[PDB]
Structure 1
Amino acid sequence: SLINTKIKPFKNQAFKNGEFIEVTEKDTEGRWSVFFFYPADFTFVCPTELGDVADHYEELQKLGVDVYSVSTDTHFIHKAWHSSSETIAKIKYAMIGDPTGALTRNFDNMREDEGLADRATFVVDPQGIIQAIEVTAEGIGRDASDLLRKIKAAQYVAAHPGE
C-alpha cells in the first residue's frame, strides 16, 4: 500500500494559468501537495470534481497547499480543454500531462487495460509522505470540502503529535 510512504521522483510537463511548465518531485519538497488523478479530458462526464477543487483553491493556497490534477492526456490537451470548458477554465493550479503513465504508475493508479488513471486523490506532506488516499469508481464523486477537511486535519496532526 501507499499510505505513509514517500512519493517517487517524477518529471512531467503541465499547463498552469496559460503557461506550460515542468513539474518534478523537487517542486513539492517543503510543501503540502494534492495529487488529483482523473481518467480523461473531453469526455461526457460532468467536470464537477475538478471545478470544486478549483473553488477551494483560494483557501488551499492559503494553507500552503499546492494542487496538481493529473491525467494521461498531454499538457496540450489540458490547454485546449481549459478553453473549451467553463468549468475547467476556473482552474489555476497545475494540470499535469502524463502520456508515459509514469507519474500514474508511481502512485500505482493506472487502469492498465485502458491507459487511463483511476479517480484517485493523494495528500502529501512537506516530507513527501502520503497522509491521505481516496479512490472511487466512475460516477462516485469526490467531495472538495471533505478533502479540505482531511488536509486541515493532516496539518493539525503534524503540529500536535498524539492526543
Structure 2
Amino acid sequence: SLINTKIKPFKNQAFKNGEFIEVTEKDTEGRWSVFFFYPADFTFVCPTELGDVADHYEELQKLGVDVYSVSTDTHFTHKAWHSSSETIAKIKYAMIGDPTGALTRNFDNMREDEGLADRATFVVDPQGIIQAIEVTAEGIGRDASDLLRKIKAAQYVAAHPGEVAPAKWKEGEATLAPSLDLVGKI
C-alpha cells in the first residue's frame, strides 16, 4: 500500500472560505495534512463525513493539521455546493478540485470506470510520509473522532521515538518501549 511512502507533487485549484486558491505539495511541507477523498459533489446524501471534519477543524488546526477534501469535480462546483448546502457551508478548510484525476491517482484512489475517487482518508506527516490510511465502501461512515485519535497518536510517536502506541491508545495511557526483554513478554 502507500503506507509509509512520500506523497507525490501536485498542483490543483481549490475553493477555500469564499476564495479560489492554488494548492501544491509545497503547502504540505512542514505540516501535518489530511487528504480526505470523496466521490462527488451535489449527490443526494447528506455530506455528513465532511461536516463532521468541519466540526473538528478548529481542534485540528490547533494541532497544526491542515485538511484538504478532494473530489474529481471542479473548484467551481465546490463553491456552488458550499452555497447550496448548510452542511458544506460549515467547511473552512480547502476543497480541492481534481478534474484531471492526477491527485487521486497519486494516492492510487481512482475508480477508473467511473472517473470518481473512492472514499479514502490519508494522514501525512511534516516530511510527506503517509502514516495512516482508511478506505470504506458507501454507507460505512468515516468517524472524524477516530481520525483525531490516529493523528494524536501519529504526532506522539513522532515526538517520542523509541516508543510505540498500543491498541486503543489515548493520551495519558501507557506506551511500550521496544526492547529485547519485552520480546514475547506481553
| Whole-Å separation in 2 of the counterparts to 1:19 and 1:112 | 30
| Whole-Å separation in 1 of the counterparts to 2:62 and 2:130 | 20
| Whole-Å separation in 2 of the counterparts to 1:77 and 1:46 | 16
Q: Secondary structure at the match of 2:15?
A: strand
| Whole-Å separation in 2 of the counterparts to 1:31 and 1:78 | 24
Residue 103 of structure 1 and its aligned partner are, at CA, apart by 0.1
Q: Secondary structure at the match of 1:87?
A: helix
2:6 is the counterpart of 1:6: yes
Residue 107 of structure 1 and its aligned partner are, at CA, apart by 0.1
Q: CA deviation digits over 1:101-125, x for unaligned, max 9? A: 0000000000000000000000000
| Whole-Å separation in 1 of the counterparts to 2:12 and 2:154 | 26
Residue 58 of structure 1 and its aligned partner are, at CA, apart by 0.5
Larger radius of gyration: 2
Residue 130 of structure 1 and its aligned partner are, at CA, apart by 0.1
Residue 99 of structure 1 and its aligned partner are, at CA, apart by 0.1
Residue 46 of structure 1 and its aligned partner are, at CA, apart by 1.8
Across the aligned residues of Structure 1 and Structure 2, the Cα RMSD in angstroms comes to 0.4
Residue 161 of structure 1 and its aligned partner are, at CA, apart by 1.3
| Whole-Å separation in 2 of the counterparts to 1:106 and 1:27 | 16
Residue 45 of structure 1 and its aligned partner are, at CA, apart by 1.4
Q: What residue number does 2:155 align with?
A: 155
Q: Secondary structure at the match of 1:69?
A: strand
Q: Which runs of 5+ in 1 are unaligned?
A: none
Q: CA deviation digits over 1:5-45, x for unaligned, max 9? A: 00000000000000000000000000000000000000011
| Whole-Å separation in 1 of the counterparts to 2:89 and 2:4 | 33
TM-score by length of 2: 0.87
| Whole-Å separation in 1 of the counterparts to 2:86 and 2:15 | 16
Residue 51 of structure 1 and its aligned partner are, at CA, apart by 0.1
TM-score by length of 1: 0.99
Residue 136 of structure 1 and its aligned partner are, at CA, apart by 0.3
**Identity over the aligned pairs, expressed in percent?**
99
Q: Which runs of 5+ in 2 are unaligned?
A: 163-186
